[PDB]
Write a protein that binds this ligand. Structure first.
Ligand SMILES: Nc1nc2c(ncn2[C@@H]2O[C@H](COP(=O)(O)OP(=O)(O)OP(=O)(O)O)[C@@H](O)[C@H]2O)c(=O)[nH]1
Ligand SMILES: Nc1nc2c(ncn2[C@@H]2O[C@H](COP(=O)(O)OP(=O)(O)OP(=O)(O)O)[C@@H](O)[C@H]2O)c(=O)[nH]1
Ligand SMILES: Nc1nc2c(ncn2[C@@H]2O[C@H](COP(=O)(O)OP(=O)(O)O)[C@@H](O)[C@H]2O)c(=O)[nH]1
Ligand SMILES: [Mg+2]
Ligand SMILES: [Mg+2]
Lengths: 49, 433, 427, 298, 35, 432
């Protein structure tokens, strides 16, 4: 029947959910600590007037 | 919320509808009974109280058989039986039948159904109409419905996905007559077109996909991939989402020239793609090689006027920018003088989900091009050629005359497309002295 | 005291603003919930400048987030800092502009500005002594290029006195993602010049340079590109918020920066930028910072300053330093590059100091420049606009919104009358 | 043009290897300290899903101090339309996981939901305590019309979260339904009290002031509001544990003025033989049927 | 006379148009919230 | 407490009495024995005995026994008390005159005695429900007699009236214009409302909406019961806006001679058509205004509404009722007379309508009913006048009626009383 044979129901396939997650985080990119933090200074390292 | 409505007409309309809506259901995870076991879920499948969903399409035809196939098919229980519309007698490759006598009995019913479907929707974005110029129903009935739809909704966007007759092969003799006759409606009542010929897909499948004996179903899956990748920006979340309004804006510079060419990459099977590394430059130049056009015309015989460029998947703006730069540093790709900037970049993240049992392999990154270029004009020139050499002895005119439309309107449409090709040449003219 | 209302329009402005409201959220020691978790008193002495007091020791933005297309605002609400922006500060329409300036500025821009004018007016009277207004958008889109500039035309009528700073995103020619960009750019630059105190010309090409060569990042996405604009964001107002040896604010630089009101197009920069490889063997000192400003490479504008003469130049240093080296270096760079400054203004360099350095860093600087070479960008928009206006191409998308053609003619007239008087000052 | 993988030592490989070392070191420090999201979530969810053993109803009655479980049965809901989840539902404490990842502190107030699971565990086990104001000693028999309270310990040792609800205002309401909402709070007030009522409206006054049996259908009525504990089998809530139901306090009535099946409630006591199991999963005797042949004789 | 009577009714349609828009905006806000 | 008594007349009345009273048993939970199962909304229809069985407060009447005897042998033989079902030995046989002057008075006293007993049982009687047909002789003649004599026993009491108007094309009789014209006088001076419906309109509805290509009278009987349930539903069950029978009379009848509304029910869709459609309250009011879904063969796009009663039922929110009625007002092919700037009345009920087994409507969460009074119903009377004068010109069938004992002058007068009625319906159509 052509049409029936082609559009058989065929379960077992479930759509992906996490490739979008990977691409979101790739577009996010590296955080502040790996962007500009120098000499691994902590929060209170330079806060004096 | 954003919503599309699909207006499929004819045997071609209903079969591309089968393939496209199947891909939509399989991507979103909809079971064939209409149930579920990060966006959209309202543009295409509106949801009822019991968790069921109902597609936003109408399939119309003047013969029952192909729609009765769906009514008995796999997804018989998914589509609302009101939406699928049929008639006893078809148009039989005649625009006159499809437009003047048998179209009227049903056009009110079709418009009532689409008015209801609009009242379901809250914010309607636009209409996508799928048909062929060569079919009597898909030509005449679609022309009437577009004519009445434009005056029912003045502002709503109307896109065309049409099967243009191929330059050499076709399945009808009076097909140039029907193609000629549909153009006045598709000129004065449309916004954008995607005329695609079947021969180009035949060659591209025999070339890249290694299927020497394809099917119309294999054609249909690729066209479904085209439309899904186009609507994917509304269907999902993205860095650079594009709307139908956006790419109408960068596909129509002038209101009478709304005829792009569609192209897709990468088109490749599992064994073939097991080796060749797929990247942004490769797909972006494969989309530029004239062997990949879905329209039988050579862009090297024209100049690009505008390019709408939709990426999808693990794409990065850096490599899109680099790919655009590499394709811009090229002389073989020409541009009209008045377009210094030429590209729309849209980006979506969902990697293309494969229909199992089809032909395409599982691909992580994909690209579609909608190129407004002037090289489509020679196709209409050849259509004009065959129309003249069949109109000269008044061949096949008696069918139309006896149905009841006047003969001189044929010459009217001939003059219309003569003027249209004249505008295309005028646009191709450049003011460099 | 001196409070800033941060405007935010377009997809770009919505994102860099969420990026901007991440750094000043990080530094001021406020957690993503809304509570302060910093250590020192100085971090909460002036937080009225960006944050609004709310019951329970929780602070809320003075930020207005506008976008015609509701698609982007779900992403801002779903970031790491998506539990900080007030929902009533979100105002949205249902339909986008489709990258048309005319639509966002005339047809659908009318129905939304009443909403945006309402909430800024609510935040106008909320604080006592506002310092000014500050906006981020893109001139290459349809909303920020469009309805973003419509607010500028409106708020300048409401509050003439307050300074207005715009960190706008100028399109690049070598990398273009829109063909109606030279239309919307021509129709927004015309709107900028009469109603804006100081414009920070930001682009995306030069930012793509900086990560590739100065930071050696192999996959610099839009997020890292948004990092650097947010860095320059805080450096402009790093003196208003904190003490120092020589304090400043938005007005002190602006009066020191604008000799004639037509010239307010700037050229921003950020100093401590080096690779992830060089996190140890690189000294963080005053002179090497100054050596980093005055290259053409660190620059995030789309022009080479060596083709023009710097009219005026301001350097805002952050962190604690002895002062004598700066005047020695700023004078030194003035003497050696004497041919690259205009003679008719002496002592061209402006210096201001805050004592507090930013978070995770010991010393920082921000350089804002008015130079001749910003003219090189404006001539070449017209190099594109003329090519598209002469064939009347893509025009009917605009004339369908009720506007005339003469607005196109007069927009080119005003930019032409900008560069012509800009060129006389170089010569 | 030939972008390579991690270890191929290519092009911009040096800087990437530096950056890999940086991220790896940061992750190592957090792993050693114990601040990883995986670690934190694993510990807190273990302390949630810890199993226990229930009390045994010796006389077929419920007492103060007995560990129990609140379960609504699966009556034959032919009237229910749309989508309604079947099975026996159990009232269990439901937290907000987003706030769990934001802050490690206990979440006051903490929601209550229904999950189709009758296994006793740390999420759904209620001790029946006294009124506080009234001296109902431990081991005394629960009576109709007598206030009592239920409590669940969670998180830090010694927590005594009590379920409460209050008269509806505009500023507090159920998340989706909009009716009066019920939640868990640590404080002790008069709003904490709950009463039990007999099923049939006709003989409720006759059965007033009588001992309450276990694993039997009753109605729950909050004292101050007079409303009832009800579950919306149609409204759903997706959480980390899964698909959980919506629970509110609003009395529901049919056309004959009797409580509809969403107001039915069953206490749960432990199986005397197997401790992990409850009474509702006790086995049934295996015997054969004689009614067919018996009626055949007649 | 008749012209005035037509404008007497085209002022009314805007009221229910505003009501419809307001209800649709609220539904849009809730559908954004859950997402 | 409220109570309603049904005065169903004729084979139309009796067969309606089967379908409507089947629904009343299933919604209240009555077994066909009468006793509720072992495991007081019902009081308006049923009545408690000592035995705790609920006897219906209806009086089936007919002039032939065959129609009623099927009830005496049917499933509900033990529900209806024997004295309530009244029969006769001979019928009028398609004749107004037989059922009004020579056969009617034989059983006038017996039914008027029985109706008093059912009225005695009711302390506060809400009203009288009368179901008949203009076609049949007993449905026209006898139904005209008791309405005249009901008026002299209870002057205040409302007499709601549901009938079967002759269909404009299909016809199960020939002389029925005489029955249709002559009865209308009593419906003019001795009725307080009307609910006229045509079987042909319902034939259109069932095939078009329920997909049943071959309906029967039951399919037409079931929908009528759904109408009568919904109007009374605000009495039986609690709602946000309860509306009584006296309430809706006021807001639907602006003039004493204008008491002919039109009925409409929505949604009426099969399970496979309730499969793939979301049912919102907006989706079921726009259906109640289209002529194709109406129940009389008349188009209010040819007339002007003067009053509308909205009867909502189910999981409805009063917010969205206001949204729906607002959109209807923004439409030019829905008109109103100039003296009705506010032309709505809304009632709200909580309990969704039940579903009978063996029916066609699927179980649905919400419903709408409508009683719309328009002047486009006047055109229905015009065709009846047009057909009546084609046949009174040649004095066809006249000898039957005189031979049954009525004077020929009423043929003139009953023709004329409608002529004034049609003229009265055109004065309302004029706008000052
Ligand atoms: N690509 C593609 N083309 C199709 C498909 N089905 C039909 N066509 C084209 O449609 C043309 C004929 O038009 P039809 O759709 O068959 O006929 P119609 O539109 O119903 O009009 P009538 O012939 O009068 O009934 C053929 O030449 C095909 O090229 C399809 O599934 N895929
Ligand atoms: N819609 C509908 N019409 C009915 C039904 N039963 C009878 N009728 C109508 O009744 C008309 C004939 O009159 P009947 O009711 O059968 O008889 P009658 O009213 O007792 O009067 P006589 O025939 O003189 O005895 C027919 O035209 C039918 O349209 C019914 O169940 N539903
Ligand atoms: N600098 C920067 N530019 C961006 C970002 N996101 C989008 N853009 C730019 O914004 C332009 C499109 O702006 P658009 O969204 O149409 O503006 P709108 O129409 O006013 O909302 C594109 O050319 C992008 O390059 C971002 O995060 N940072
Ligand atoms: Mg065909
Ligand atoms: Mg009869």
């Amino acid at each position: 029947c052509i049409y029936r044979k082609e559009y058989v129901p065929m379960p077992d396939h479930r759509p992906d959910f996490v490739s979008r997650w990977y691409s979101k985080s790739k577009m996010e990119g590296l955080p502040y600590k790996h962007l500009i933090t120098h000499h691994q200074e902590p929060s209170h390292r330079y806060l004096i007037s | 919320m954003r919503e599309c409505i699909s207006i499929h007409v004819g045997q071609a309309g209903v079969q591309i509808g089968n393939a496209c809506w199947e891909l939509y259901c399989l991507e979103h995870g909809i079971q064939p009974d209409g149930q579920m076991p990060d966006d959209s879920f309202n543009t295409f499948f509106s949801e009822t109280g019991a968790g069921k969903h109902v597609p936003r399409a109408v399939f119309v035809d003047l013969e029952p058989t192909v729609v009765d196939e769906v009514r008995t098919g796999t997804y018989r229980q998914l589509f609302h039986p009101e939406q699928l519309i049929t008639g006893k007698e078809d148009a039989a490759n005649n625009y006159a039948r499809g437009h003047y006598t048998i179209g009227k009995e049903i056009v009110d019913l079709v418009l009532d159904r689409i008015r209801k479907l609009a009242d379901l929707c809250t914010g309607l974005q636009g209409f996508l109409i799928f048909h062929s110029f060569g079919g009597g129903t898909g030509s005449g009935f679609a022309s009437l419905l577009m004519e009445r739809l434009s005056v029912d909704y003045g502002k709503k966007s109307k896109l065309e996905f049409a099967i243009y007759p191929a330059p050499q092969v076709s399945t009808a003799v009076v097909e140039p007559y029907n193609s000629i006759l549909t153009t006045h409606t598709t000129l004065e009542h449309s916004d954008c077109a995607f005329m695609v010929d079947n021969e180009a897909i035949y060659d591209i499948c025999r070339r890249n996909l290694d299927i020497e004996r394809p099917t119309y179903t294999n054609l249909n899956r690729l066209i479904g991939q085209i439309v899904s990748s186009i609507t994917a920006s509304l269907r999902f979340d993205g860095a650079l989402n594009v709307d139908l309004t956006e790419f109408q804006t960068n596909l129509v510079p002038y209101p009478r020239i709304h005829f792009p060419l569609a192209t897709y990459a990468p088109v490749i099977s599992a064994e073939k793609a097991y080796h060749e590394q797929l990247s942004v430059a490769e797909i972006t130049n494969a989309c530029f090689e004239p062997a990949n056009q879905m329209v039988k015309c050579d862009p090297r015989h024209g100049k690009y006027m505008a390019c709408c460029m939709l990426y999808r998947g693990d794409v990065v703006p850096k490599d899109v920018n680099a790919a655009i730069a590499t394709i811009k540093t090229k002389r073989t790709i020409q541009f009209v003088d008045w377009c210094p900037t030429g590209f729309k970049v849209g980006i979506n993240y969902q990697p293309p989900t494969v229909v199992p049992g089809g032909d395409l392999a599982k691909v992580q990154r994909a690209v579609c091009m909608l190129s407004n270029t002037t090289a489509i004009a020679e196709a209409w020139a050849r259509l004009d050629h065959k129309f003249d050499l069949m109109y000269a002895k008044r061949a096949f005119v008696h069918w139309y005359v006896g149905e009841g439309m006047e003969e001189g309107e044929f010459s009217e449409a001939r003059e219309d497309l003569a003027a249209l090709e004249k505008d295309y040449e005028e646009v191709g003219v450049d003011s460099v002295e | 005291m001196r409070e800033i209302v941060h405007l935010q329009a377009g997809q770009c402005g919505n994102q860099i603003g969420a990026k901007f409201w991440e750094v000043i959220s990080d530094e001021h020691g406020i957690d993503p919930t809304g509570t302060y978790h910093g250590d020192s008193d100085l971090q909460l002495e002036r937080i009225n400048v960006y944050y609004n007091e709310a019951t329970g020791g929780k602070y809320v933005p003075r930020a207005v987030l506008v976008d015609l297309e509701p698609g982007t605002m779900d992403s801002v609400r779903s970031g790491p800092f998506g539990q900080i922006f007030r929902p009533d500060n979100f105002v949205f329409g249902q339909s986008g502009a489709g990258n048309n300036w005319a639509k966002g500025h005339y047809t659908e821009g009318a129905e939304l500005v009443d909403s945006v004018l309402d909430v800024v007016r609510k935040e106008a009277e909320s604080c006592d002594c506002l310092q000014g207004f500050q906006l981020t958008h893109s001139l290459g889109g349809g909303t920020g290029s469009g309805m973003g500039t419509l607010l500028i035309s409106k708020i300048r009528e409401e509050y003439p006195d307050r300074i207005m700073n715009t960190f706008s995103v100028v399109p690049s020619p070598k990398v273009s993602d829109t063909v109606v960009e030279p239309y919307n750019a021509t129709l927004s630059v015309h709107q900028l010049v009469e109603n804006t105190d100081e414009t920070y010309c930001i682009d995306n090409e030069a930012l793509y340079d900086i990560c590739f060569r100065t930071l050696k990042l192999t996959t610099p996405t839009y997020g890292d590109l948004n990092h650097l604009v947010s860095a320059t964001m805080s450096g402009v107002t790093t003196c208003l918020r904190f003490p120092g040896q020589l304090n400043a604010d938005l007005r002190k630089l602006a009066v020191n920066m604008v000799p004639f009101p037509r010239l307010h197009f700037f050229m921003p920069g950020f100093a401590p930028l080096t690779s992830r490889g060089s996190q140890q063997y690189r000294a963080l000192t005053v002179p090497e910072l100054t050596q980093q400003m005055f290259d053409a490479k660190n620059m995030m504008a789309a022009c080479d300053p060596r083709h023009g003469r710097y009219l005026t130049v301001a350097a805002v240093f952050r962190g604690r330093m002895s002062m004598k080296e700066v005047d020695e270096q700023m004078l030194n760079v003035q003497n050696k590059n004497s041919s690259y400054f205009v003679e008719w203004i002496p002592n061209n360099v402006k210096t201001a100091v805050c004592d507090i350095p930013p978070r995770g860093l010991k010393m920082s600087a921000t350089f804002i420049g008015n130079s001749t070479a910003i003219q090189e960008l404006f001539k070449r928009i017209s190099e594109q606009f003329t090519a598209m206006f002469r064939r009347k191409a893509f025009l009917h998308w605009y004339t369908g919104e009720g506007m005339d053609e003469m607005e196109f003619t007069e927009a080119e007239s005003n930019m032409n009358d900008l560069v012509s008087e800009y060129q006389q000052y170089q010569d | 043009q030939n972008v390579y993988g991690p270890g191929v030592r290519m092009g911009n490989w040096n800087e990437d290897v530096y950056l890999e070392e940086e991220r790896m070191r940061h992750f190592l420090e957090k792993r050693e300290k114990g601040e990883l999201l995986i670690q934190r979530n694993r510990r807190v969810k273990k302390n949630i899903l810890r199993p226990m053993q229930l009390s045994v109803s010796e006389d077929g009655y419920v007492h103060y101090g007995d560990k129990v479980i609140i379960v609504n049965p699966d009556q034959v809901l032919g009237e229910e339309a749309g989508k309604f989840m079947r099975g026996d539902l159990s009232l269990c404490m439901s937290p907000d996981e987003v706030k769990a990842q934001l802050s490690d502190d206990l979440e006051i107030p903490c929601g209550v939901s229904a999950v189709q699971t009758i296994a006793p565990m740390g999420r759904n086990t209620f001790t029946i305590l006294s009124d506080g104001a009234n001296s109902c000693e431990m081991g005394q028999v629960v009576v109709y019309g007598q206030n009592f309270c239920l409590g669940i310990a969670a998180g830090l040792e010694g927590k005594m979260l009590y379920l409460t609800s209050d008269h509806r205002t505009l500023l507090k309401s159920s998340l989706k339904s909009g009716l009066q909402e019920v939640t868990l709070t640590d404080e002790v007030t008069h709003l904490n009290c709950w009463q039990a009522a007999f099923l049939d409206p006709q003989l409720r006054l006759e059965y007033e002031g009588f001992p309450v049996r276990a694993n039997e259908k009753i109605v729950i009525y909050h004292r101050h509001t007079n409303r009832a504990l009800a579950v919306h089998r149609n409204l759903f809530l997706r959480t980390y544990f899964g698909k959980e139901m919506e629970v509110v306090a609003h009395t529901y009535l049919d056309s004959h003025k009797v409580e509809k099946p969403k107001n039915q409630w069953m206490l749960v006591t432990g199986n005397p033989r197997n401790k992990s199991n409850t009474m509702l999963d006790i086995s049934k005797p295996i015997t054969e049927d004689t009614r067919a042949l018996e009626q055949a004789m007649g | 006379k008749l012209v005035d009577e037509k404008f007497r009714k085209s002022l009314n349609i805007q009221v229910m148009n505003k009501l419809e828009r307001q209800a649709k905006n609220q539904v849009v806000q809730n559908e954004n919230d859950e997402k």
